[PDB]
Design a protein around this nucleic acid. Structure first.
Ligand SMILES: [Ca+2]
Ligand SMILES: [Ca+2]
Length: 293
DNA sequence: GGGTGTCTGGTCATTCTACTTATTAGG
DNA sequence: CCCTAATAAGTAGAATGACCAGACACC
């Protein structure tokens, strides 16, 4: 099936990844071969998404990545042109746009065949220094003067509604929390959450204004730390979160979790979450959602 | 006979998702 | 007071993101 290009870019801002390998090769005029790529790796349940992206782009190969994960990967230089042209017409907006543009600069370097020269390889490693995790130890030793790993901030309003639908199909979670309450029954609470590394702190705050609800929580795990955009006021969920993703449909297995999420929402609108059979019906919905189903 | 592009089949590292429970806010 | 909705700190762990080695393919 075909996939909307804004939903695609949004999804890519979530799970996508750009790569540039500068590997030592003795039989290389320049001493290094170079590989460019874009891949999306997901659990094997959502391999359907990967088939639609591939069918829409007409490029890339779907292959297993371990027992439980699958990847669509584009490495063939001619096929990267299709990637590039897509993201030029539907640019991303996360700090990953910086990597994409480094990805694209490398492509231009190669398109002019400058990767077959001492100076070209030199520019590619300088491009690579700012890409994702920067240069490897071998590459640092070989190019001990290429040191500037600093990068520029990306700031972009949400460009289209379908972007968020795609992005949320990546980083979102529609949760039904059951908390112990002083009562005959157990409180039921719908919680919508989207996490992101703090480089995109500003985009996370954008969602409050873009959606008209929610708050940001800061979470930490030793040296690592992320930001979560949450929505726990039922008002906002009944009127804002749910209607939006109903107008701009999600894709992949998260749609099912969403559709179950709204099933519980209806019950909580009918006040049946305070009844016996109510907490029984919702309880069963939670049980078959997310982990499970 | 170089020389370069592309694929197979992964693994490594952490940013995500998803799940707990304490606690306060509120009509 | 009540009974309930809503915010919040915290963490687990695996689905992500990023990188890896080797060999094949082609002009
Ligand atoms: Ca992501
Ligand atoms: Ca995802």
């Amino acid at each position: 099936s075909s996939i909307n290009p804004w939903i695609l870019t949004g999804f890519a801002d979530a799970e996508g990844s750009f790569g540039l390998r500068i590997r030592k090769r003795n039989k290389s005029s320049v001493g290094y071969s170079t590989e460019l790529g874009f891949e999306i790796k997901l659990h094997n349940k959502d391999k359907s998404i990967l088939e639609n992206i591939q069918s829409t782009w007409g490029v890339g190969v779907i292959a297993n990545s371990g027992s439980n994960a699958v990847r669509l990967r584009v490495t063939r230089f001619e096929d990267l042109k299709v990637i590039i042209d897509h993201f030029e017409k539907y640019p991303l907006i996360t700090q990953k746009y910086a990597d994409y543009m480094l990805f694209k600069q490398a492509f231009n370097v190669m398109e002019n065949k400058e990767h077959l020269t001492i100076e070209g390889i030199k520019e590619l490693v300088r491009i690579k220094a700012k890409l994702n995790w920067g240069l490897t130890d071998e590459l640092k030793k070989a190019f001990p003067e290429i040191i500037s790993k600093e990068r520029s901030l990306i700031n972009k309003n949400i460009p289209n509604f379908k972007w968020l639908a795609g992005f949320t199909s990546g980083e979102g979670c529609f949760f039904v929390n059951l908390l112990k309450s002083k009562s005959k029954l157990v409180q039921v609470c719908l919680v919508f959450s989207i996490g992101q590394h703090i480089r995109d702190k500003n985009l996370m705050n954008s969602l409050i204004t873009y959606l008209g609800c929610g708050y940001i929580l800061k979470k930490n795990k030793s040296e690592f730390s992320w930001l979560e955009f949450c929505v726990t006021k039922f008002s906002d969920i009944r009127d804002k979160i749910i209607p939006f993703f109903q107008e701009y449909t999600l894709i992949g297995t998260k749609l099912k979790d969403f559709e179950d999420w709204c099933k519980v929402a209806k019950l909580i609108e009918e006040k049946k979450h305070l009844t016996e059979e109510g907490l029984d019906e919702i309880k069963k919905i939670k049980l078959n959602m997310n982990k499970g189903r």
